[PDB]
Structure 1
């Protein structure tokens, strides 16, 4: 999962291949049926469980509006 996503996010040729036929590209890179279903339903929580890190809690607020 992590290997595919990292390649796909950097490589414009693989990105254009993905956009033409997402299911064919995900299967060619070994993604399971439930991984593909997670992608097509947009379940980002499920993909995080299947990769290994939804135990990884992530809070992303790095500023406040109270001044000083």
Structure 2
């Protein structure tokens, strides 16, 4: 799961965190998240995020 891998990195890495805060969509796209994954993040739909992984 690239989604899970990304969240784990983002959560521990302050450089990536700051890069994310500057440009969320760009960083998410560069890390290979899908448009629906990105949309879920930007709309704050946690329920769907968990659907788009498997938990």
- Superposition TM-score, scaled by structure 2 size: 0.94
CA distance in structure 1 between the aligned counterparts of 2:51 and 2:6, rounded to whole angstroms:
16
Deviation at 1:18, TM superposition (A): 0.0
| Deviation digits for residues 5-62 of structure 1 (CA, Å, limit 9, x no counterpart) | 000000000000000000000000000000000000000000000011xxxxxxxxxx
- Secondary structure (helix, strand or coil) at the match of 1:51 reads coil
**Aligned residue pairs, count:** 53
- Superposition TM-score, scaled by structure 1 size: 0.76
- Between 1 and 2, higher relative CO (CA 8 Å, sep ≥ 6) is seen in 2
Q: How large is the RMSD of aligned CA atoms in angstroms?
A: 4.7
- Runs of 4+, deviation exceeding 6 Å: none
CA distance in structure 2 between the aligned counterparts of 1:19 and 1:45, rounded to whole angstroms:
22
1:7 corresponds to 2:9: yes
Computing the radius of gyration from Cα coordinates, the structure with the larger value is: 1
